């Protein structure tokens, strides 16, 4: 449950920085690796977090 | 075996330190890391 | 110690 | 488990942008409000994320 509010907070930030084409490819990775199981939601959270930090050190042009 | 993936990723024209960070943040996924790097 | 930063 | 890995990533990033004693004092305040329960970990994760996001939106000079 708490995982869902966290996931919603990551996504709001993520869509400001990542193109829709990349988020679609992320969803495709999560589906093939995890299906629609809850482990997939936790992976998405972890991936978006690390990628956002990697994105900011590179330089956010937004 | 996975050093091959990061070397292909570097051959896209990206610094090694960034490539390693993105490749592991994208779990095992070379293509997802590539699409991430090319989206920057 | 998860809440600690030292 | 996964929650602790998530928090360790946040703590590593956060310490690059905010003074360590001040983050540490935030942690003590959360400890006073939640004890050793997982709700304390879950609150600080949300707080550290939101602090990082507003920091990057303001402008990270680091
Ligand atoms: Zn950005
Ligand atoms: Zn900063």
Author numbering:
A (entry chain A), D (entry chain B): 17 to 78
B (entry chain F): 166 to 205
C (entry chain I): 74 to 79
Copy text verbatim from the article accompanying this structure deposition.
Here, we report the high-resolution NMR structure of Vpr, complexed with the C-terminal half of hHR23A, containing the XPCB and UBA2 domains, and a 2.2 Å resolution X-ray structure of the Vpr/UBA2 domain complex. Crystallization of Vpr1–79–L-hHR23A223–363 yielded crystals belonging to the P3121 space group. Surprisingly, no electron density could be located for the XPCB domain, most likely resulting from its loss due to proteolytic cleavage during crystallization. Mass spectrometry of the crystals confirmed the presence of the UBA2 domain but provided no evidence for the presence of the XPCB domain. Crystals contained four Vpr and two hHR23A-UBA2 molecules in the asymmetric unit, and the structure was solved using the phases from the native Vpr Zn2+ anomalous signal, collected at the Zn2+ edge (9.65 keV) to 3.0 Å resolution and further extended to 2.2 Å from a dataset collected at the Se edge (12.65 keV). Further interactions in the complex involve Vpr’s α2 and UBA2’s α3 helices. In the X-ray structure of the Vpr/UBA2 domain complex, the features of the interaction interface are very similar to those observed in the NMR structure: the backbone r.m.s.d. between the NMR and X-ray structures for residues 14–78 of Vpr and residues 315–359 of UBA2 is 1.07 Å. The Zn2+ atom is coordinated by residues His33, His71, Cys76 and His78 at the C-terminal end of Vpr’s helix α3. His78 is the penultimate amino acid in the current Vpr construct and the Zn-binding cluster is important for maintaining the global and local architecture of Vpr. Amino acids F34, W38, L42, I46, I63, L67 and I70 (helices α2 and α3) of Vpr pack against UBA2 residues F354, L350, A343, A340, Q339 and L336 (helices α3 and α2) in an antiparallel manner. In addition, residues at the C- and N-terminal ends of Vpr’s α2 and α3 helices, H45, Y50, R73 and H71 and UBA2′s α2 and α3 helices, Q339, E345, N347 and N359, engage in hydrogen bonding and ionic interactions that contribute to binding.
